[PDB]
Design a protein around this nucleic acid. Structure first.
Ligand SMILES: [Mg+2]
Ligand SMILES: [Mg+2]
Ligand SMILES: [Mg+2]
Ligand SMILES: [Mg+2]
Ligand SMILES: [Mg+2]
Ligand SMILES: [Mg+2]
Ligand SMILES: [Mg+2]
Ligand SMILES: [Mg+2]
Ligand SMILES: [Mg+2]
Ligand SMILES: [Mg+2]
Ligand SMILES: [Mg+2]
Ligand SMILES: [Mg+2]
Ligand SMILES: [Mg+2]
Ligand SMILES: [Mg+2]
Ligand SMILES: [Mg+2]
Ligand SMILES: [Mg+2]
Ligand SMILES: [Mg+2]
Ligand SMILES: [Mg+2]
Ligand SMILES: [Mg+2]
Ligand SMILES: [Mg+2]
Ligand SMILES: [Mg+2]
Ligand SMILES: [Mg+2]
Ligand SMILES: [Mg+2]
Ligand SMILES: [Mg+2]
Ligand SMILES: [Mg+2]
Ligand SMILES: [Mg+2]
Ligand SMILES: [Mg+2]
Ligand SMILES: [Mg+2]
Ligand SMILES: [Mg+2]
Ligand SMILES: [Mg+2]
Ligand SMILES: [Mg+2]
Ligand SMILES: [Mg+2]
Ligand SMILES: [Mg+2]
Ligand SMILES: [Mg+2]
Ligand SMILES: [Mg+2]
Ligand SMILES: [Mg+2]
Ligand SMILES: [Mg+2]
Ligand SMILES: [Mg+2]
Ligand SMILES: [Mg+2]
Ligand SMILES: [Mg+2]
Ligand SMILES: [Mg+2]
Ligand SMILES: [Mg+2]
Ligand SMILES: [Mg+2]
Ligand SMILES: [Mg+2]
Ligand SMILES: [Mg+2]
Ligand SMILES: [Mg+2]
Ligand SMILES: [Mg+2]
Ligand SMILES: [Mg+2]
Ligand SMILES: [Mg+2]
Ligand SMILES: [Mg+2]
Ligand SMILES: [Mg+2]
Ligand SMILES: [Mg+2]
Ligand SMILES: [Mg+2]
Ligand SMILES: [Mg+2]
Ligand SMILES: [Mg+2]
Ligand SMILES: [Mg+2]
Ligand SMILES: [Mg+2]
Ligand SMILES: [Mg+2]
Ligand SMILES: [Mg+2]
Ligand SMILES: [Mg+2]
Ligand SMILES: [Mg+2]
Ligand SMILES: [Mg+2]
Ligand SMILES: [Mg+2]
Ligand SMILES: [Mg+2]
Ligand SMILES: [Mg+2]
Ligand SMILES: [Mg+2]
Ligand SMILES: [Mg+2]
Ligand SMILES: [Mg+2]
Ligand SMILES: [Mg+2]
Ligand SMILES: [Mg+2]
Ligand SMILES: [Mg+2]
Ligand SMILES: [Mg+2]
Ligand SMILES: [Mg+2]
Ligand SMILES: [Mg+2]
Ligand SMILES: [Mg+2]
Ligand SMILES: [Mg+2]
Ligand SMILES: [Mg+2]
Ligand SMILES: [Mg+2]
Ligand SMILES: [Mg+2]
Ligand SMILES: [Mg+2]
Ligand SMILES: [Mg+2]
Ligand SMILES: [Mg+2]
Lengths: 214, 122, 113, 54, 118
RNA sequence: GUCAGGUAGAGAAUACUAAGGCGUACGAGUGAACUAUGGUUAAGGAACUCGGCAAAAUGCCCCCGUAACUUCGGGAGAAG
RNA sequence: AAUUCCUUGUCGGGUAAGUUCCGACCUGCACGAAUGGCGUAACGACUUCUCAACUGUCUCAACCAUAGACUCGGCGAAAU
RNA sequence: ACCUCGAUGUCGGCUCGUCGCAUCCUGGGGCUGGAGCAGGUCCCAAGGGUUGGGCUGUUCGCCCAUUAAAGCGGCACGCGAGCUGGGUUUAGAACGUCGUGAGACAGUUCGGUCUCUAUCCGCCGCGCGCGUCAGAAGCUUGAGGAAACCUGUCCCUAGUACGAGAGGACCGGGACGGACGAACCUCUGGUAUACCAGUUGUCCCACCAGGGGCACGGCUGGAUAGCCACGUUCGGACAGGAUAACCGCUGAAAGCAUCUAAGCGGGAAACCUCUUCCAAGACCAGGCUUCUCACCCUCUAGGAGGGAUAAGGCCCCCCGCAGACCACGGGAUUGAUAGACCAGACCUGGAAGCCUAGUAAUAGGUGCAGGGAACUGGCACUAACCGGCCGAAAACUUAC
């Protein structure tokens, strides 16, 4: 029903079309993934599949985590995350210890990507929320770039909780929707995303079958 | 990249040399103009025996822009001077012969007379 | 190691000839017009080239009637019927960023001999 | 802006009490026949003889 | 090398250029100096670049080291007793060891010196 | 109020230096906003604004040639 | 008009539009001739308008090196 | 004239919004003096958006060119401990008028100091402590909050239906656009202060040759990475449920009739889900596994105090595209985190020296040369360790 798989961004490039065009493509290394858990509604309250990825030496992994992996029946992995299903028909095909690779996706189908946006730092109001600066001339008095007025006076005499102003951006989960997959492989699990996805080089991204059009 | 108060070349033989942009058209808060965008421009100076006199308000389409504009194959356009073509309500030029080259975008923008009559399409 | 090499090789295109910035080249452009296919000729001067593995990319710029014209294709473009460099050009800058503000007799390109 | 009222005993002392310092751990090293104390930053330096302790 | 990420150490490019040249010259002249620990961190690339140039003795390297550090005496000693003495060693020319914090302003000082094991 | 070096220089302007005296008494680090002092910026060039405020721009020497007007000096280093 | 409330008077020039400006009309509330009237070559850190160049003043902000803002160490303020 | 004259700062403009619906468009309906398009009017509907300029200090208003529109208002005629002083609103001067006169004129014209280091509330973000009942590591479901919610044009049906003609349909597809937001550095550009080169003056290294120092980086041409937009992708649903207005069915009170009082229904950008993020401090403090699941001493045997442990955590180290400090993330010899070497790519463009030709200022060869940060790998040569510190069950009641 709904497919998904984890991946890693290493670069971002372009590839050529059969319609003779050129399309930018994001390198996504969807390395091999192993099923470490199954979630059943009667025993837990929902249906989902938990996946682990990466290679970590057995001594760098925390001992309870290593024990949990041994109980699951697979060697230790780097990061762990789950994919949520919606019916037990898709649940029944997944079993503990099963291995998933990138060929499960067929080219021509939209995909959705989820990752952590870049760490931009504590930024000003105008850069963050796209405000407009005032004149840097005509007698400005050191308020060149700072927002200014916030609300009424003595009624309500406050700020309107939720007002858009200064704060740190980035370093949070961000999703991009309805993306081309241009080309997939079977050899070493490399998946291609036409466009630009959020995250970092050598960062963590998860790709899921598109909900919008699929 | 044509804005308000933008200062442009004329690529026509209507009798006008230099036009000033009036507005960029296409929608609310229309902000930039690209190759194949119909705009409105006013004539600053003209040939003494020209068809149009200075001060007229005439619709125009820009054909030669300095800023890069991508095509479907990644093709970016840098020209040497901002130029437009004087156009009328029937999507037709006011002149009869054209100076300089033109871009392919006019063909997709249905302007057939200009692209056909231009000395070379690029 | 650009781990995408064994994925690039699937669509990598052969018979790629050598070219450098500042070289005079022409490109044939496949254009569909009313469900009819035809071929155009675009002559110009390469001003920049940035490789990408399978994604080696370059620009082409020409001069017509004293006003420059450009088309930009990546190397392995299936639209490019042929990459026929006319004469190899010698340019001090491998990127021709300054070619935007040289007019007429200024914007000529040196020819290697 | 200025304060308009005196901030009370509890408020002042509660805010002030969070400002403190932390005592670190010490490292014993066997150099020159004596065991002297360095932070762990200096364990290798102490064993080789590259750090000056009065 | 990678530039210092933040606002620069001494407060301007010319100033840190002169500062780093003087630190490299004094360190190469003496052998063991005690300086501010981040200063030694930023010192490491410059002295290591000098060792790289020294490894291959020639006229061009003479002039390169001269234009870098401005002292005939230190360049001569650098090319004569430091250069060949690191012929068989690839990288890792300086050692950083921090010491008791400064009394004046509690800045962390580090003792930076050439490796004289070999 | 008095001494007034060298090189460029019209020069006591300005740039670098000698004789000679200083680094003028809080420092060490961290790519945050933001403020202040500055540099650069695709392309349009006053569309913001009360105003081209601020900025930006020309700028030196020698030649060629310089209008309307006028109290016949000027305007005029006109402009180029 | 440094005088005009209605008034952004009417008419002409400049731009796409000009309650400002320039030139005329006189319906001068409430010009006017030593508390001077009308022009005037030249000058003005004077007032108003237009033009070519110039530009981050703007469209729409971006980056960069400074001095603070930040943490640590030393001393240690005030309005209320 | 009830609060404020031992002080409530005033019009406009910039930035920043919020709320109501008497709605400008977009959405759904009733009627027509609505042949069709094209209209007029009324109802429901606040989800979203609602031009830029010339003029004047303007609000307003007139004019110029589009779009779907360029909404009405409230919020101390929103907002100066956020900014402007253009006018009102000081001290000069002048014009016209009034007053013999000092002076005045909601008449005009010129320039005329806008202070405050945030205590609290509030807010945007990030941290320390504590409990969730032995102690820890993960994954989470999720009540409950937030974000978004806009739209134009062309072609087919069909020049058919209709209309005398001119003219010209509803609905639905297909395609192509914009403004807005989110993300990223492939392209293309901006920036680029340890990268290279050219160049004026001066000072220095014994001579020159060559170098550097300073003069806003002395001035320029560039430019890897990183940061960014003007650059490139994507999004504004479909569908489902109950509704406003409206349209119905079988139907009586009242042999009829009637959308309704029993009932059965259709019906929109509103409403609830569907999309994305936060989220068990959600105090009903949730759920599934994994790991160490017993060594004592003391007071006096009721409990309590102190010590010795494991899993795990912390300290400290190198650091990061993570960052104000913190927090977050990676690694520690059984090791590639940082530094450097080599190689490669890239930028830069023909190093130094020698020789030759030219009296000379140069050019040529040795040579796809010299120099070079962030991009990739191999090597421990250096730095991160002969190690310390925190850190284990009072029990009771019922059924099985
Ligand atoms: Mg943004
Ligand atoms: Mg701004
Ligand atoms: Mg300022
Ligand atoms: Mg003198
Ligand atoms: Mg000096
Ligand atoms: Mg002296
Ligand atoms: Mg600041
Ligand atoms: Mg500034
Ligand atoms: Mg520039
Ligand atoms: Mg411009
Ligand atoms: Mg002007
Ligand atoms: Mg104005
Ligand atoms: Mg000025
Ligand atoms: Mg004159
Ligand atoms: Mg004259
Ligand atoms: Mg003159
Ligand atoms: Mg008058
Ligand atoms: Mg007047
Ligand atoms: Mg007069
Ligand atoms: Mg008038
Ligand atoms: Mg005005
Ligand atoms: Mg009058
Ligand atoms: Mg009078
Ligand atoms: Mg008189
Ligand atoms: Mg008088
Ligand atoms: Mg007089
Ligand atoms: Mg007069
Ligand atoms: Mg006169
Ligand atoms: Mg500019
Ligand atoms: Mg902006
Ligand atoms: Mg810098
Ligand atoms: Mg400082
Ligand atoms: Mg500071
Ligand atoms: Mg600070
Ligand atoms: Mg103090
Ligand atoms: Mg009263
Ligand atoms: Mg009272
Ligand atoms: Mg007061
Ligand atoms: Mg107020
Ligand atoms: Mg006020
Ligand atoms: Mg209503
Ligand atoms: Mg309607
Ligand atoms: Mg109606
Ligand atoms: Mg409404
Ligand atoms: Mg909404
Ligand atoms: Mg205006
Ligand atoms: Mg309000
Ligand atoms: Mg107000
Ligand atoms: Mg308001
Ligand atoms: Mg108001
Ligand atoms: Mg304040
Ligand atoms: Mg306040
Ligand atoms: Mg006044
Ligand atoms: Mg006033
Ligand atoms: Mg007065
Ligand atoms: Mg009188
Ligand atoms: Mg009298
Ligand atoms: Mg008197
Ligand atoms: Mg004045
Ligand atoms: Mg004031
Ligand atoms: Mg103040
Ligand atoms: Mg305070
Ligand atoms: Mg919920
Ligand atoms: Mg650029
Ligand atoms: Mg840049
Ligand atoms: Mg520099
Ligand atoms: Mg010298
Ligand atoms: Mg110098
Ligand atoms: Mg300077
Ligand atoms: Mg330069
Ligand atoms: Mg960037
Ligand atoms: Mg009935
Ligand atoms: Mg009936
Ligand atoms: Mg809990
Ligand atoms: Mg532990
Ligand atoms: Mg950490
Ligand atoms: Mg280059
Ligand atoms: Mg040389
Ligand atoms: Mg390097
Ligand atoms: Mg690396
Ligand atoms: Mg202990
Ligand atoms: Mg108890």
């Amino acid at each position: 029903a709904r497919k998904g798989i984890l991946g890693t961004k290493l670069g971002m490039t372009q590839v050529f079309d059969e319609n003779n065009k050129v399309v930018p493509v994001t390198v996504v290394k969807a390395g091999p993934n192993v099923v470490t858990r199954i979630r059943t509604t009667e025993r837990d309250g929902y249906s989902a599949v938990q996946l682990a990825y990466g290679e970590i030496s057995p001594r760098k992994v925390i001992k309870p985590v290593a024990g949990q992996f041994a109980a699951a029946g697979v060697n230790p992995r780097r990061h762990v995350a789950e994919l949520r299903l919606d019916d037990e028909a898709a649940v029944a095909e997944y079993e503990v210890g099963q291995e998933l690779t990138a060929e499960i996706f067929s080219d021509g189908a939209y995909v959705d990507v989820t990752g952590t946006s870049k760490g931009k730092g504590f930024a000003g109001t105008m850069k963050r929320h796209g405000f407009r600066g005032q004149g840097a001339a005509h007698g400005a008095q050191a308020v060149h770039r700072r927002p200014g007025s916030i609300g009424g006076c003595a009624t309500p005499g406050r700020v309107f909780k939720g007002t858009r102003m200064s704060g740190r951006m980035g370093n949070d989960r961000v999703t991009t929707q309805n993306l081309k997959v241009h080309k997939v492989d079977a050899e070493n699990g490399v998946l291609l995303i036409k466009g630009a996805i959020p995250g970092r080089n050598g960062g963590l991204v998860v790709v899921r079958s598109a909900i919008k059009r699929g | 990249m044509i804005q308000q108060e933008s200062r442009l070349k004329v690529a026509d033989n209507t009798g006008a040399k230099e036009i000033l942009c009036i507005r960029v058209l296409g929608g609310s808060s229309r902000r930039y103009a690209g190759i194949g965008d119909v705009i409105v421009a006013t004539v600053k100076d003209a040939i003494p025996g020209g068809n149009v006199k200075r001060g007229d308000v005439v619709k125009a389409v820009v054909v030669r822009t300095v800023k890069e504009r991508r095509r479907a194959d990644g093709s970016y356009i840098k020209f040497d001077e901002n130029a437009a073509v004087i156009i009328k309500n029937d999507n037709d030029p006011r002149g009869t012969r054209i100076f300089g080259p033109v871009g392919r975008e006019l063909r997709e923008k249905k302007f057939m007379k200009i692209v056909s009559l231009a000395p070379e399409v690029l | 190691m650009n781990t995408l090499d064994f994925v690039d090789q699937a669509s990598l295109r052969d018979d790629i000839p050598t070219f450098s910035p500042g070289d005079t080249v022409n490109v044939h452009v496949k254009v569909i017009e009313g469900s009819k296919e035809r071929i155009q000729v675009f002559k110009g001067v390469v001003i920049r080239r940035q490789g990408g593995g399978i994604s080696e990319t370059f620009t082409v710029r020409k001069e017509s009637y004293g006003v420059g014209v450009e088309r930009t294709f990546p190397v392995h473009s299936p639209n490019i019927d042929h990459i026929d460099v006319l004469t190899r050009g010698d340019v001090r800058r491998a990127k021709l960023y300054y070619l935007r503000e040289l007019r007429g007799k200024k914007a000529k390109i040196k020819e290697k001999r | 802006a200025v304060p308009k009222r005196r901030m009370s005993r509890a408020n002042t002392r509660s805010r002030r009490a969070q400002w403190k310092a932390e005592a670190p751990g010490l490292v014993t090293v066997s150099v020159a026949g004596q065991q002297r104390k360095v932070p762990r930053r200096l364990l290798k330096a102490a064993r080789l003889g590259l750090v000056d302790l009065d | 090398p990678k530039p210092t990420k933040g606002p620069r150490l001494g407060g301007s490019s010319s100033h840190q250029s002169a500062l780093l040249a003087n630190l490299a010259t004094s360190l190469f002249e003496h052998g063991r100096i005690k300086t501010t620990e981040p200063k030694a961190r930023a010192l490491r690339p410059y002295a290591e670049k000098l060792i790289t140039h020294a490894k291959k003795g020639a006229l061009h390297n003479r002039r390169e080291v001269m234009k870098k550090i401005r002292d005939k005496d230190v360049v001569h000693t650098l090319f004569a007793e430091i250069g060949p003495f690191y012929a068989d060693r690839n990288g890792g020319y300086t050692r950083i060891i921090k010491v008791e914090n400064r009394k004046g302003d509690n800045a962390p000082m580090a003792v930076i010196e050439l490796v004289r094991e070999k």
